[PDB]
Structures are given as C-alpha cells and as structure tokens.
Amino acid sequence: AEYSKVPDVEGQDKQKAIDNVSAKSLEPVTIGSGTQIKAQSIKAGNKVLPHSKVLLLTDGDLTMPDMSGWTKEDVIAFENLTNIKVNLKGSGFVSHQSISKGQKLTEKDKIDVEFSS
Numbered sequence: 001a002e003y004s005k006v007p008d009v010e011g012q013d014k015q016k017a018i019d020n021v022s023a024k025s026l027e028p029v030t031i032g033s034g035t036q037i038k039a040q041s042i043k044a045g046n047k048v049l050p051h052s053k054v055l056l057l058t059d060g061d062l063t064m065p066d067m068s069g070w071t072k073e074d075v076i077a078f079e080n081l082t083n084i085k086v087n088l089k090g091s092g093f094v095s096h097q098s099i100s101k102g103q104k105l106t107e108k109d110k111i112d113v114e115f116s117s
C-alpha cells in the first residue's frame, strides 16, 4: 500500500500549488477564482492514497467546482473547506450537482449532490 505525502501549499501561487500537489501523485482541485491558495483540505505532511484529491481554496470569490465522479469523502471535504452545506443522496460517485461548475458561491448557497454506483 503506497502512500503519497501531502505538500504544504497554503499561501502559494495557484499554479505552483497545483504543480506541487500533482508532483506528489495527488489530484489538485481548485475552488475559487483567485490566484493564491488560502486553504487546503488535507493537512500538509499527512499520508494519503495516491491519486486522491486535495481541494485547494483560492482567495477571491468562491466558485463551484465540477464534482462529477467525486466520492462522499471529497464532497464532505468541500463542505468543511467552504462552510457551504451539501446534501448527499445515494452512493458511489457524483452523477449530479445542483449548481453548475464555475458559478460564484456565497455562504448563502446550499448544494444537492446525487451519487450513482
């Protein structure tokens, strides 16, 4: 069971952070329309499965990611990172989200996601 070590990318330039996460054989997913990373979903230094997702919250506006194919773990990480409540329905992988990718979000919004096996 090989593990990846999550890098510390908080405060980094967005593209540098994406590159640093990818270099650890992890999948960076950015949230927001900013140019600098404000927060990461996994504590730096932690061992996680290769190719698992690290959510990266930018500065500036929050925007909706493409959650297609996400696990419950991933969607729950999004709720904790953004303080936007997500309602989960079903099991497997995300097959529907109630807000389209790219839309600006506020803590006024709520998301419904459906999972399919």
Ligand SMILES: [Cl-]
Pocket: 025, 050, 051
């Ligand atoms: Cl691999």
